[PDB]
Structure formats: C-alpha cells, structure tokens
Amino acid sequence: YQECLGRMTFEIPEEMEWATYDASRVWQISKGGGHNFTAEVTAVGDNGSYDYDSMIFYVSEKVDKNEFHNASNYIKGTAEIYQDHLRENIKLDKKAISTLQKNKSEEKSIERIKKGIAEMEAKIPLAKIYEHDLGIPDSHILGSKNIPFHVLLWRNQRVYYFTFSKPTENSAQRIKDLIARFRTRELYEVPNEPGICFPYGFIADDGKTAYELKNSLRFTRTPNVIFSLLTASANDPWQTRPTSGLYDSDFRPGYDRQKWKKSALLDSLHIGKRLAAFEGWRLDPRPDSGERERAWFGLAHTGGTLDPLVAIQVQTFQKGTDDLTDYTPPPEEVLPRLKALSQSIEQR
Amino acid sequence: AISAPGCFIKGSNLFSEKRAGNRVRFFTTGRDYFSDLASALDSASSSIFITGWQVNYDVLLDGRRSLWQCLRQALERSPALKVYVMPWLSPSGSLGTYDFETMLAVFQLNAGLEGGARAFCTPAIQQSDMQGLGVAFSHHQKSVVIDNRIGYVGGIDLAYGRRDDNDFSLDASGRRGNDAYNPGLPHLGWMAEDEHVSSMGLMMATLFDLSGSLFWTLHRLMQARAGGHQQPYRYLDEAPQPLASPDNARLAADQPRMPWQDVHCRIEGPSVYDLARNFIDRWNGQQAYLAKTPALQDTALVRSALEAVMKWLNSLAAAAGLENYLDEKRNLRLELDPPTPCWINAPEQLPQEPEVRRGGMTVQVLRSAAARMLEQEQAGRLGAGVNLPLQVGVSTEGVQSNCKDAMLLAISGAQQFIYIENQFFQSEFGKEGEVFKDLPLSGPMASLRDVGSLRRDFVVRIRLEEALEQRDLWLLDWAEVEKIAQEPGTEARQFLKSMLAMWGVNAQGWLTHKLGEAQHGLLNEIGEALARRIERAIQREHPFHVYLVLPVHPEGALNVPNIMHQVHLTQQSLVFGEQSLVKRIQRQMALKALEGKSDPAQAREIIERKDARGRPVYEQQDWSRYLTLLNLRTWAVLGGRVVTEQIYVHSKLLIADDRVAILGSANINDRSLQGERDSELAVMVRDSEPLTVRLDGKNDAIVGKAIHQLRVNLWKKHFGLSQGPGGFVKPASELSAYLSIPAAQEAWEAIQTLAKENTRAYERTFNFIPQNISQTQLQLTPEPPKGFEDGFPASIWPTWAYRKPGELRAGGQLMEPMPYQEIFWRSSNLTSVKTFPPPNGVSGFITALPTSWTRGERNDSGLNLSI
C-alpha cells in the first residue's frame, strides 16, 4: 500500500486513485490541459515536465486503439485546416491585386503586397505533417520534414504523449533513447532505481536531471475531498510556485452570509519529518435554518530551496456536482488521514 | 393580417392587443429622429410624457436647439401644458458616470413659469422578485408621447452618441463635449480650461441658490417646486455651454469617434393611447410606492445633512446672500414638508378612449414586467382612483414576457426569411466546447484575475490579501503601500497605478454568489428558436434563411473582465458551444444527408464519430445555407494617421417576411428577455397594404412596402451606398441589384464574399483589430526557416502571443500595443509611435465575423451571470 509521484514515495492509508487524462478527450491531446478526475471535480494542470529537450507528458485512462488513431487524426486535421486557411488567404490576396491593377491605380504598394504574397507562399510548405516509424511497437510518431516530435504510445490501454519544444537535428535519436529508457508501471508498485514516478509509468535515469510533476489524489471512501500533490526539483528552469492553479478565487470564495458562516483554517501538519503550516479557510452552516453543506480549502508547501519542493493542496467539491452523492464531511473527520499520509513522504 | 397564417401573440398577461389605424413613420438614423422630435415638441399643446433609460437635456435636436430649450419654449407657448418625465433610477449613486443632472434640469424647467407647477418628475425604482440580486436591474423603457396623439418608441434614447449621420464618420472635432462617444479608447482631450461648465459647479450653485432617504427628500423638495422667477440661468437659457465628464477630458482630434447605428419609429393613432395608459399606470404605481413613510432615523440624518449644507453655505461669505422661498436665509424652520403625490387623475390628462379605425398600420405594444411591478401598479390605480377602460385579454397581476414570446411566435410562424439586427447575443449553448475546467485560465484573464502571481516578494511584505478579503480601507496597510510606492524602479512606479486599478476592480467580489448555488447557463431561447425553425426547413427541404448583425464586441475596452466574459458567452452561443447554433444546424444537416442507409436510433450515434480529419461527422456540413453572421467596421484618416473603428450596432430591429418590422428595447440577453428582471417597450407593427416583390428572383411575393423600404435603406447604408461624397469608404454598388432579394442564394453569396474581402484588407493593414490568426506570433525568439508553421488562433487581445496555448506554465505577453492603451496613441518621447500604411480595396462597412477569435481560451470572470 505505497505509491510514488515524481521522485518521492509515500504510504497510503486506504484505497486510492490517481488522476489521468479524460478518455472522452484523449483524441485532442495536442491541446493538453492535464489529467482530471471527472469533468467538474478536476484541478488545473496535472502534467509532468522533464529537462530532456523541454519534455512534457500526459497519461490517459483506459482507452482503445480507435481513440489512439483518432488522436493522430486530430493532430493531422489541425495542420490540414491551417493549410486551407493559408490557401484562402492567397486566393483573397490574388483577387485584391487583380482588382488593384486597373489603369494606373494606387502605386508604391504593388511591391509591398507582392512581397507579402512572397512571404505567405514561402511559409507554405513548412506546415506539412509527416509521420515516422522509428521501429517502435505501436507508436504514432510525428514530426517535421527532418526533425521529429509529438511522440505517441499505447500500452495496457494507456496513452503516452511526449512533446519537445526544441528538438535538434538528432531528435529521433534522443526520443528513441528516451522511450527505450521508458517502462510501464502499475498502481501500488514502486521500483528500486532512480528515475521519475508518474501514474502508471516510470523512466529510469541517472537521477539528477531536472523534473516537475503535479497530480491530484482522492480517497475512494470520501470522493467529496481531493488532494493534489506537487513535486519539483531544486532550482528548476520553470520555477513553479506552490499555488500553481488556484487563481485567488478558491482563496476567497463567494457565499451568502445569511445561510452559511466562514472561518479561517490554520492547522498543524508535518510532511516527512519537517513541520509544515496549513493556511486555508472553512465554510460552516448556520443553525438559523436547515443548512447541511460544507466546503473548505488548505495548502501546505514546505520545501524547495535546496530539497525538492513538496506541496499539498486540499480542495472540496459540493454534493451533486457530479456522480458523487454524499455530503461533504467536516475537516476534522478527514484531516487525520491526511496527517497519516503526509508523514510518510520520503525521497526515494 | 390574413395574408399570412402568423398572427400576434394572444395569451393572458399581455399588456395590450393589436390596434389598427396607426400612422407609422420609421427612423433609421438618430439625426432624423431628433429633428422630428423637435418639430413635434414645437407642435405640442396639452401634455407630454417622457420615459427613457437615460435622458439628457444637453443633446441637440435640430443642431441649434437643445431638448430642455425646446421643452421650455413649449411651456412658454402653452400656458396649460403638463409635462411628466420618468427616467430610470439607479438604486446606488451611479452604476457608472453617465450623468446625474436630469433631476436638477427638470427643477430648472419650472423656474420663472407663470402659474402653478405644471411639470413633475419621478425617478423609477426597479421591481423584481427578491431585489437583493435585483439592485442591478433597471428599466429599458423608451417612449415619448405628445398630447396623447403622437408617440415614439424604439432604441434611440435622448443621450449622447446617438445622433449619427449616414456617412459614419470617425472625426470627433465637430461634436461638442460629451457628444464625442467612444468608450473603448482612453479619452485624452480637455475642454474646460475656461469655457465649459463643471458638473459639480452648477449643482453646488443651485444649492447656494436654495440657501437612503436623501433622494426621497430631494424629490420632496422637487415636488415643493418654486415655479416662479428665481434666477435667470446663463449657462442654459442664453449661453448654452456644454457640460463635461467628471474628469472633464474629451476625445482628442486624432482619436476616432465610435459610430452608432440604431432604429426608431413614430406612431399616431389609438396605440398612442396604449402608450399613454402604460405611462400613467407606471406613474401612479411609483407615486403610490412613494406614499410610504421613510425611516425616522433616515429623516434625521437627512435633516442633519441639510443643516450642515446650509451651515457651510452661511460660512461661505459670498454665497450667503438672500433667500426667499422655504429657506429665507436661515431665518425659517427646517425642511420636512409633508408628502403630497401628484397623480394623473385629472380628466384632461386621462386619454380619451380611441375609436377602432381600419387599415393603416396595425401596431401592438409589448412590455415585460415583474409581479412586484404589476402589484405596485394595482396599488397605484387603487390609490389614485384611476381605472382606464381595458380590452379583453389584458392582465394586471403576474409577469409579462411580451418581447420574448413575440419573437418566439414570429420565429415559429416565419415562412421564407428573417433579418435580425441587434446588440447582444446570449442564449443557451449547452456545455462549453473546446474549453475545459482542467485547462488553465487564459493569459490576459489570469493576469487580471490573480493578484499574487506578479512580484511575490513585493506582495508578501504588503500582506494586503486579508485587507482585500475583509474590504477595509483602514485594514489596508498605509505603511506597506507607502513603502512599495517609495521602492525604487520605474516598473514599480507603474505597478502602483496597476495595483490601485486592480483593487478598484476587485474591491467588491462578493455581491451574490450562494443565492441558492452557483450555476451556469443562459435562459432565453431565441437562439434555439432560430435553430428549430432552421431544422424544420431542413426537414421539409424547402428554402429558408436567417441573418444576424451584431457589434464586434460590447461597448467599452477589451480589458474589462465582464466585457471579456460577454465575449466568451457570445462566442459560445454563436459557434464555440457544443450545442450552439452552428452545431445544431450542422447536426440536422448531417442527419438529413445520412438518412439514406441508416437505422433510426442508430443514426443518432452514426453522426457522432470522427473522419480522417479527426473531427465528428456533423462538423463536415456547411451552415452558410441558413446563417450569415456579420458585423460593421470602417476606417479614415484623422490628423495624418490611419485609424479604424467599429460601428456599434445598438439597434434592436427585427424583420419577419417583409410583413413585420419588430422594434423596441429588448436585447438578446436574459436580463431583458426573461421578464422578471428588466422592463421595456417593444412594438410589433403590421402592414395593411399589399405589394408585389420578386423575393428570390423567380417567384412573385406579396409583402409590405414600408417594411421593404426600411430594410432596403438599412442595407443601403450598411453597404456605404447612401453616404455623402468625400467619404473614405467607397460604395458597394454591385449589391444594389442584390439588396432586394433576401431569398435568392446569389445575394447572400455576394454579400459574404464582399465581407470576406473587407476583412482580408483590414487584416493586411492592421493586426490589433480582432481577427482569427494572431500576427504577433512571428515577432518572437523562434526562427521561420527552422520549419515553424503552426498558426495559433488570436487571443481576446490579438497582439497577445502564446508560447504554448495548451497549458499556462509557458505564458506570453503582448507584442504590440492595443488601442485601449495610452502608448498606442500618445507619441511618448522615450519610444517611437507606430503608423500603418493606408488600407486599400475596402468597400462598404460590413466585414466578416471572426469565429476563431479566442479559440480554446478560457475567459470567465467568475462573477454572477445575472450581474
């Protein structure tokens, strides 16, 4: 009963589930937002980063090869539609210049519009989408004319997408090395070598290259309350902040003072061995009339300057927002289990 | 009304029924309406009722005389005149900075008038279900009825920026003061060095001349009116000096005004009685509401306030002169005059019941109102002892949604074509498509929304998070804000103003959230009405069409979160949403084209999976067979620089088979269409004379002539053909043939191609204007020769560039100034201003509507859908 995220491992008190990409959204993964629980009980931005040529990856839930094909179909359709738009611009410009050339009309702009057309046509061929093979079982690998990127994979009914913002001339070499080092993994399984731990995956390395992962967590007993785990290396090139996706609206929610009452939430919670603060808020019903609903928020983020940054964000979801049909338990009911989980976090 | 199966609305809560024998004269520009209003007021003899969303007396009617001047001349001419004015009242001091001088102008309207007080003013209080959320609601009723015989209704309220000519000119030097309307730009002029009139100066001057129940007592002293000679005012009676904004800044010479397109009508007949009954009932209801006794504590507070005001006036040695009415230079008692409402129970003021006449132009008056408003009007009728005779089918308790139900019935009864020209578009669109909750908040919106993202070290010292949460100026730390102001750095110096603006925006963020629970979704059903009619046309496979003309973006700058959220909801309703108008049309067309070899229940899933492009089946269909969404734009040269500006389509006009020309003041948002929030006056005019027309070029049709001419003139202006010589926009003469054919396809194909050509020319010249594909992407670190051809959709600020749109860990910024910024227009010495080569090939004012603007970008402010 233990799991690892990023480079840290922890012990889980009871049954748990990770957040993976939406099966209904798998095909449009080039526009990646992140993993989610369901449509409405998600968080913002659950995905991982790696310093190997500015790498980002996502993990899908159980999908099939039809959706795996639909993903590359969408990636191709994007470039197709851009080509169509580019061609219609050329058509409109040609009609405009044909109407312009009429009996010594506007001068000193024909060269301008012609050089514009020249640029517009020069940037035409680079938008073609080319597919590759690379000798990888069941991989829809894409890329440019020579430099490849946008990796795809399908193992154990999962999807692994690996994109690199700055691939060089040896991009195929680098990405095939990386996917050679890649290895699938299973829930409640923790390896014994340095690498990266994300839900249902592990890539081994020397254990020193920078990383940044974030995911959300939820007990199967209490679906109304979720916890999102944040991990990153020390002094990473992205300098991710402890909040990272809260937008100063979950800090100060709106409510009617007539039927509910709010209060601060400062508790005690030590992660690993070091002690951490817990600054948030609590929403409590008032005994004036029948009000049985709750909500609260909290965040603890000790670390980062020398050790890997570890942040825990607690967020509650109201009854009836989704398939969940249970009232929100008060914080004191579920905080003991969070304390039990937080004390068992250690780095490899 | 027998030439078509479609008839008026016929329910129970209807305010009134159709009345024939009406003389209807439509108006297409504001100038014509103002001129006709001046002439009618010059003809006025007996009684005038005025109601409007915003009434201003600074406006010029005929170009030489203002509204207050015309009204005063009417009063001088008629010794038995009776004027009642009923604007809309904001429950707070002011929602914005429109004006606040209407009450004092009506006060000065009785100054020096022989005889008793023949004029009365009564601000209108909104009335809805619970009003806790309803404080924000208003009255959108516009009407002027003259001598119970001539009435007006439309969307053009007697306000600034409404009087526009056929040319659609961008030059603002001609207009005076507050008449140069352009909310988008930061106005950078200045008028009141020594010429114009300060807004505060005249009101404190009127306080000097005199020598929350404050509004109640001010209207009480308004009712206790000194109609005799008190003082000849220079600035409004012999020296008509223009007013100014609170900051008294104007639109600069090289800054374009914002053109304004609206429609209006004049009526004469028995329906003027309908409008007069509406005004009288509302006036009586508001008087009865006023009859309630206010709080004694509030009365004492107002007494102390007026005592302090008169003490300050006495301390002002120059101001402490002489008084004669109700004050007597402090030698009299206090001001607690007993209330005495002035009803409209006089038999002269009561309109006579009009006879039923035949033919002409039948008109119906439509109202939306709340149960509270109706019960207040019943209370007013009982209190004043006034009960006008009513037709059979009218109700007085309940709710009205006459505008919404009327639009629904016209949609359900239309046969060939519909033309719409509106201001807003907010209906149901399903659950949002291409936008998801896991997706990070957009670039610009996140910059506006999050307050700790920028300068974490500078925010952790001020620690004003708790201050802004608790909403306390004293809790705001003066020491920390002063330390940050004194911190070194020009960027810090700008950051002080930026964070002051952020506090101004975010000070009140808890208006009404948990009134029940947070929900999403629009309520009114005009969009799905269009979709259902279009789908019936698809199902029967016979020609039908619908247009929509709307503004590019709502009034104001594009850096205001509520305006951005309205753009989000507009795009979701139009196209983006998963069950939008385009999606519903595409689904029906796919279902039709796939009805050959497909099981009934199976097809509902067969139309769903993707093609080789990866996109679902129904996305392959072309909706341009049922929809032509268009906007309006122009350009000019002011002061040696190329400028462009949108034409705000503020009209609320609607056409139904060239037989009906709807008009009024109901938008396409819930706040106006649902009925329980806001009140309005829309009319539903019906013709009575037949005219032949070759609508589709092959089959003859029998429609009206006034409606046909109104639509022809609307298009004629819309294409630049009606404007005068010398303009910067050439006419679209090739559409003079196609204007009269709304059912032939070649007409809409021609207009659509012209729209696309105009859009392409504008895109070639400018890049800050809204378009689909961002042009600031090229100005970045990535090099073109490597092989970077992505073409990202433009954001809500089209110069904003995205390094990676999918997430927010990358981020971006603006690469070139936006028009609402100051560095756009002001040639700062430390930088160099950017100019653009003149555009070419641009004919007409209509341009394509950008449906890839803000694609996959999350612009939600988190504020109430109602407010």
Residue numbers in the entry:
A (entry chain B): 26 to 373
B (entry chain A): 28 to 238, 417 to 1072
The article reads:
PldA, a phospholipase D (PLD) effector, catalyzes hydrolysis of the phosphodiester bonds of glycerophospholipids—the main component of cell membranes—and assists the invasion of the opportunistic pathogen Pseudomonas aeruginosa. As a cognate immunity protein, PA3488 can inhibit the activity of PldA to avoid self-toxicity. PldA is mainly composed of 27 α-helices, 25 β-strands, twelve 310 helices, and many loops, folding into three regions: the core catalytic domain (CCD, aa 24–935), the peripheral helical domain (PD, aa 215–441 + aa 647–721), and a small C-terminal domain (CTD, aa 936–1094). Compared to the open conformation exhibited by PldAFL (pre-open state), PldAtruncate presents a highly open conformation (open state) and the PA3488-inhibited PldA reveals an almost closed conformation (pre-closed state).
To understand the structural basis of the intrinsic activity of PldA and the way in which PA3488 inactivates PldA, we next determined the cryo-EM structure of the PldA–PA3488 complex by single-particle analysis with a resolution of 3.05 Å. The structure of the PldA–PA3488 complex indicates that both proteins tightly interact with each other, burying a ~2020 Å2 solvent-accessible surface area, and PA3488 acts like a crab claw to clamp the HKD2 and CTD domains of PldA. Four interfaces participate in the formation of the PldA–PA3488 complex. The specificity of binding is due primarily to a salt bridge between the Asp643 of PldA and Arg50 of PA3488, combined with complementary van der Waals interactions between the Asp643 of PldA and the Gly70 of PA3488. The results suggested that PldAD643A and PA3488R50A dramatically decrease the PldA–PA3488 interaction, which is consistent with their functions in stabilizing the PldA–PA3488 complex through forming a tight salt bridge. In contrast, in the inhibited PldA, on account of the binding of PA3488, the 310 helix melts, allowing the region to instead form an extended loop, stretching out and following the α3 helix direction and resulting in the formation of a shorter α3 helix than that of apo-PldA. This is associated with a translation of the lid toward the active site and a rotation of roughly 140° (based on Cα of Ser121), so that the backbone atoms in the lid region are as much as 4.8 Å away from their counterparts in PldAFL. On binding PA3488, the whole lid region slightly changes its position and orientation with respect to the active site, sitting on the top of it and almost entirely occluding the entrance of the solvent and substrate. Coincidently, activity assays showed that the PldA almost but not completely lost its enzyme activity upon PA3488 binding; hereafter, we refer to PA3488-inhibited PldA as “pre-closed” PldA. Of note, the α5-α8 loop of the PD1 domain in the inhibited PldA is structurally invisible in the electron microscopy map, implying that these helices are highly dynamic after PA3488 binding, and this accordingly imparts flexibility to the lid region.
